[PDB]
């Protein structure tokens, strides 16, 4: 599923991400835009052999099991394919574990390089929330 901007903002809000660990909703929408272009089926392979999955591009070296990343952890205890569903529940629950691990949203390179320090509230402007 390819989400609309306000559609995704509303779904993330219902799943408890607005101000989760202090990150306003606009941060999460901006990260999803530049990680996946709002497409739940996005995958990208990394140089080290791991793969990033779903709307928030969660990586198989640490967070999910895809059966082809040797020596990886599965800290969210989920198959990586569950992160590609049109239902974003599994991606959100895993993202909550990631953002709590010590480095905040800096774990998402695109957030650091394209959202951090910008006017992220613009990503939810005009939405009925
Ligand atoms: Cl915001
Ligand atoms: Cl980047
Ligand atoms: Na929309
Ligand atoms: Na893994």
Curated annotation (Swiss-Prot):
Ranges in a coiled coil: none
GO molecular function, one term: beta-N-acetylglucosaminidase activity
The EC number(s) this enzyme carries: 3.2.1.17
Entry keyword annotation includes Disulfide bond: yes
Keywords in alphabetical order: Allergen, Antimicrobial, Bacteriolytic enzyme, Disulfide bond, Glycosidase, Hydrolase, Secreted, Signal
Domain C-type lysozyme: 1-129
Subunit structure: Monomer.
Protein family per UniProt: Belongs to the glycosyl hydrolase 22 family.
UniProt name for this protein: Lysozyme C
Native source species: Gallus gallus
